[PDB]
Amino acid sequence: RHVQWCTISHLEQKKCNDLVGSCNVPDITLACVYRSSTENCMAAIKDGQADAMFLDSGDVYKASLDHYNLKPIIAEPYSLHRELTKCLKHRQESLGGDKMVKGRYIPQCDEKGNYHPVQCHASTGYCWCVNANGEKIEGTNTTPVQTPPTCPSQVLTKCLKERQEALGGKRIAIGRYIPQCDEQGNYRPMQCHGSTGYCWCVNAIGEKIEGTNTPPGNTQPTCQSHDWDTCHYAVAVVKNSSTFQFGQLKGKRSCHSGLSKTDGWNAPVNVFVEKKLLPWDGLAKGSIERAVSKFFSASCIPGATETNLCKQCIGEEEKKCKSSHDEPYYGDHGAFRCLQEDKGDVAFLKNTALPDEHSGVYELLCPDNTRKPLNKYKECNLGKVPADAVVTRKAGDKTKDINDFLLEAQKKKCKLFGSPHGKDLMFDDSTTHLAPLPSEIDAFFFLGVKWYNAMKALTEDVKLPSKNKVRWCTINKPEMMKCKDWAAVSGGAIACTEASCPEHCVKQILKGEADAVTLDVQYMYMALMCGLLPAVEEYPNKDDFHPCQIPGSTIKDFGTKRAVALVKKSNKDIKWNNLKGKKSCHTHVGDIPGWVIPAGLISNQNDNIDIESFFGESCAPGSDTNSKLCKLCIGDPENPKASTRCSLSDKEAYYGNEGAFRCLVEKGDVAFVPHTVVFANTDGKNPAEWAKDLKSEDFEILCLDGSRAPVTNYRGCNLSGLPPRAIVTREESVSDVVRILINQQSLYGRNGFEKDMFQMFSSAKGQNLLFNDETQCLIEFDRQPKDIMEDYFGVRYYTAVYSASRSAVPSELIPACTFKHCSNS
Numbered sequence: 001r002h003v004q005w006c007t008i009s010h011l012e013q014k015k016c017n018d019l020v021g022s023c024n025v026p027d028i029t030l031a032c033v034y035r036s037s038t039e040n041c042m043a044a045i046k047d048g049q050a051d052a053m054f055l056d057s058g059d060v061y062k063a064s065l066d067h068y069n070l071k072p073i074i075a076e077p078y079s080l081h082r083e084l085t086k087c088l089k090h091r092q093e094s095l096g097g098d099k100m101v102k103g104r105y106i107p108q109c110d111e112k113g114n115y116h117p118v119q120c121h122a123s124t125g126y127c128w129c130v131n132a133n134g135e136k137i138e139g140t141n142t143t144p145v146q147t148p149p150t151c152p153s154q155v156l157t158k159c160l161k162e163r164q165e166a167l168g169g170k171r172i173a174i175g176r177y178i179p180q181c182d183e184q185g186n187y188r189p190m191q192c193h194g195s196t197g198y199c200w201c202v203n204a205i206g207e208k209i210e211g212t213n214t215p216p217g218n219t220q221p222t223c224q225s226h227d228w229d230t231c232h233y234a235v236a237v238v239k240n241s242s243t244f245q246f247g248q249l250k251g252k253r254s255c256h257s258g259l260s261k262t263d264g265w266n267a268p269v270n271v272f273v274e275k276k277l278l279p280w281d282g283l284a285k286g287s288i289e290r291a292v293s294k295f296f297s298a299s300c301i302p303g304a305t306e307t308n309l310c311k312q313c314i315g316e317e318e319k320k321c322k323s324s325h326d327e328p329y330y331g332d333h334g335a336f337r338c339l340q341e342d343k344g345d346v347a348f349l350k351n352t353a354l355p356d357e358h359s360g361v362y363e364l365l366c367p368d369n370t371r372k373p374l375n376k377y378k379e380c381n382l383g384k385v386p387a388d389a390v391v392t393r394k395a396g397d398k399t400k401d402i403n404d405f406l407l408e409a410q411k412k413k414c415k416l417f418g419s420p421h422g423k424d425l426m427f428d429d430s431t432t433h434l435a436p437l438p439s440e441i442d443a444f445f446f447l448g449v450k451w452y453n454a455m456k457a458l459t460e461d462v463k464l465p466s467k468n469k470v471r472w473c474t475i476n477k478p479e480m481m482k483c484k485d486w487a488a489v490s491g492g493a494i495a496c497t498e499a500s501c502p503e504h505c506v507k508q509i510l511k512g513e514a515d516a517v518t519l520d521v522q523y524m525y526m527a528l529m530c531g532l533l534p535a536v537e538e539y540p541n542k543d544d545f546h547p548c549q550i551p552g553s554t555i556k557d558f559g560t561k562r563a564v565a566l567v568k569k570s571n572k573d574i575k576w577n578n579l580k581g582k583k584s585c586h587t588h589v590g591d592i593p594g595w596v597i598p599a600g601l602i603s604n605q606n607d608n609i610d611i612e613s614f615f616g617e618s619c620a621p622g623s624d625t626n627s628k629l630c631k632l633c634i635g636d637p638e639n640p641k642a643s644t645r646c647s648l649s650d651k652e653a654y655y656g657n658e659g660a661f662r663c664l665v666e667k668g669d670v671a672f673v674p675h676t677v678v679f680a681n682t683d684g685k686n687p688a689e690w691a692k693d694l695k696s697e698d699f700e701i702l703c704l705d706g707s708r709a710p711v712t713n714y715r716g717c718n719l720s721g722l723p724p725r726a727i728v729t730r731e732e733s734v735s736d737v738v739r740i741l742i743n744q745q746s747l748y749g750r751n752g753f754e755k756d757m758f759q760m761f762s763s764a765k766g767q768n769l770l771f772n773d774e775t776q777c778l779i780e781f782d783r784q785p786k787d788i789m790e791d792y793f794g795v796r797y798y799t800a801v802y803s804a805s806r807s808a809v810p811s812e813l814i815p816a817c818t819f820k821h822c823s824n825s
């Protein structure tokens with residue numbers, strides 16, 4: 001296997017060439033491909049001439065556009081603020097679950113708040129080993145009959161690991177730095193070198209604070225404790241021999257890391273525009289670069305075309321002003337060098353390129369027109385900037401090879417992150433670890449919506465869409481056509497977009513491409529984790545139309561289904577707590593009332609043991625035919641050769657709500673179904689023979705507390721009620737979407753004033769297009785002061801299906817859409 005790294009300069013090619021020699025990764029061979037600039041490497045990766053390079057966040061954005069179609073795959077992790085430990089968060093969530101779901105696992109945390117490596121389930125006596133994330137090591141379950149397993153100690157903290165590694169087996173790495181750790185195992189804020197006498201500050205994860213390095217014999221530095229803000233900061237660095245302030249920059253000479261860099265271009269320019277130091281607001285006044293050419297007298301801005309913006313660079317011949325180290329003033333350290341050599345009056349870079357030493361001739365130019373010392377960048381800066389990232393082709397044909405190589409090179413301690421030949425070659429010299437990004441991340445989710453739009457805003461006038469119009473997202477062609485019919489009558493309040501599926505609609509809404517979509521329950525966990533909110537919900541209750549006629553009035557019964565455990569009045573010995581091994585009937589695999597809710601509760605109370613093994617003989621269409629979940633099934637439509645048992649079809653006699661009812665009455669101890677199935681097929685409501693004369697009073701429903709009740713009390717004796725379907729949108733668009741939909745509904749709902757013009761809740765083009773056809777009306781979501789998960793799902797459903805946890809991953813989009821960002825206010 002090979003990885004071809006694209007380099008942008010001779011220095012970097014030489015360093016990459018050194019790694020080809022010095023770094024030995026079995027099975028994966030590195031190679032180095034030279035191009036003359038960041039942009040020529042981007043094109044090489046797009047063409048397959050190379051596979052990977054490291055890019056500044058600004059170029060990550062540029063590379064994500066159709067010209068190059070690259071995506072970020074690997075980056076250094078960062079932190080915004082101190083967080084609860086996972087174990088303590090987990091305890092809090094599980095303890096907040098529905099107390100009526102008894103016997104749930106509550107994690108055991110240690111005196112540092114981490115997971116004990118041995119975890120146990122009180123009500124079942126099972127124990128198992130966990131990793132530091134609290135995830136079970138599969139295959140370590142031991143039963144109460146046995147003693148608790150022996151589990152490897154948890155991995156050490158970075159500091160204690162780095163301490164042990166620095167000791168490297170010996171009694172002391174004599175003459176070498178050994179980190180000093182606190183009791184929680186984080187880095188002490190002040191670190192000192194035990195041989196040179198130098199001291200400096202680090203943040204809680206051990207990154208050095210620039211401007212704090214102090215030689216022995218000087219007053220100790222002042223170090224902040226509990227510093228978990230590890231985002232990088234754009235800064236303007238000046239010499240203390242000058243005296244102008246930030247607002248007096250017009251006409252000065254400047255050094256920038258580069259035209260396409262966030263710290264060298266986007267962050268300063270954004271501030272120039274907000275302060276009105278640049279006469280410029282939109283693409284009507286020209287290009288940003290041209291306006292910047294009028295602002296400064298002479299600069300070095302690698303990659304610029306305007307002449308005075310290259311005037312201060314010092315690259316030889318065609319190398320002058322290239323986005324490449326062949327230009328000595330390129331990049332963070334190049335712009336600092338340009339200040340240091342007095343080609344500029346100010347350099348624009350980020351805190352990680354500031355001098356380490358406290359004492360010296362440099363300080364920061366704050367945008368509030370004061371100056372502050374190097375180590376105050378957190379209060380003297382031009383904004384946090386995004387992380388930088390390794391990129392490859394969107395297709396991801398080499399992603400695994402690139403990740404594997406960098407993981408092994410780092411394990412082996414290869415010299416990735418420094419070099420004799422120069423600074424920031426291949427990777428930033430400040431980098432300490434590169435980790436894989438979420439598999440579905442793209443530039444939008446990596447940079448985050450604020451920096452993504454801010455960088456877009458410099459390249460084109462972004463016309464923000466009207467708050468008086470809802471762009472509805474459709475998932476198939478008939479929906480799109482119903483939506484074009486709505487738009488035609490809507491007077492412009494409705495417009496349409498198209499996507500392949502509900503999750504891509506969620507993505508469009510996150511990215512500002514659509515405004516609203518109706519979601520099945522099964523997509524709501526993903527949509528709420530990504531940060532959308534219910535705006536209105538589908539009210540399905542055919543009996544009481546009062547909530548629709550007089551909106552706002554309190555709702556007696558929302559009308560959603562209730563999942564119940566149905567058994568015969570005869571079978572008196574079956575309770576909830578003894579269903580194990582019995583014979584059960586399920587509408588079909590994947591049904592929420594017939595399967596998801598039952599499977600969730602069983603997993604919750606039996607250590608995630610397969611619902612397949614929990615029951616003896618059961619019928620659940622959609623399972624394997626040789627499995628015990630199909631043995632009770634029959635099929636026999638026309639009693640044909642291919643009776644299609646467990647068929648997910650009406651060819652299976654036991655499929656669906658009625659079908660699960662048959663399976664119970666004929667050969668079953670329990671059926672999992674909506675609370676309506678029994679009534680719908682007893683009291684002779686079903687003319688068929690098996691249901692004829694069945695009567696409702698002959699059955700009852702199991703309650704979670706072991707008791708029972710008659711089928712009529714499904715509201716107080718159910719496995720869980722389902723929440724209604726919801727129309728979701730962005731938080732800041734909820735009020736608009738509510739306002740527009742409730743107006744549309746006054747015209748085109750079931751009692752709409754113009755319901756002859758258009759009907760929201762039906763169509764000739766197909767069934768349940770945009771909304772479910774049985775919707776009575778849409779009702780504004782009355783947001784409560786609680787976790788939205790519990791607010792939207794209801795506590796019972798939340799804990800039964802998701803263990804009342806924010807950590808389930810039913811869609812691979814969740815890690816990408818919850819990725820945290822380095823954004824400003």
Ligand SMILES: NC(=O)OC[C@@H]1N=C(N)N2CCC(O)(O)[C@@]23N=C(N)N[C@@H]13
Binds near residue numbers: 537557784791
């Ligand atoms: N009557 C009624 O059932 O209203 C439903 C409405 N929307 C939900 N999905 N919910 C589930 C839980 C809940 O409290 O019923 C609720 N949460 C809020 N905020 N209002 C309710």
